[PDB]
Design a protein around this nucleic acid. Sequence first.
RNA 1: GGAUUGACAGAUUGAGAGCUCUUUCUUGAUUUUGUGGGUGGUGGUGCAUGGCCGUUCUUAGUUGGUGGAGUGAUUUGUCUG
Length: 37
Amino acid sequence: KLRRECSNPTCGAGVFLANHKDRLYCGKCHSVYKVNA
RNA sequence: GGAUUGACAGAUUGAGAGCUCUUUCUUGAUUUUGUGGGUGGUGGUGCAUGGCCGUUCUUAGUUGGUGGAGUGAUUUGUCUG
Ligand SMILES: [Zn+2]
């Protein structure tokens, strides 16, 4: 189980997340969502 | 098991440029590219045009209808004062 959830304002907890090592970050929250959940 | 944008911060780069990376998701086919066509084009010729303007040019000039002169190009009318 990998690649956990965002705080995406568009839909409530409903995306997978494009993440490097040691972070957690959405694929459309490109200008927002600094803290990795 | 996404044609492709773009992804915090760290050397960048006008900065939150994923421009390039240290690298993985979404609205989902509307285009990564294979011809053939305008293209942004102000880099294209006003020597192919319009339209406009300037000029010839604050000067007095121009033409056709009848008839005359000349075979005719053309003159006359449009003039000596
Ligand atoms: Zn979403």
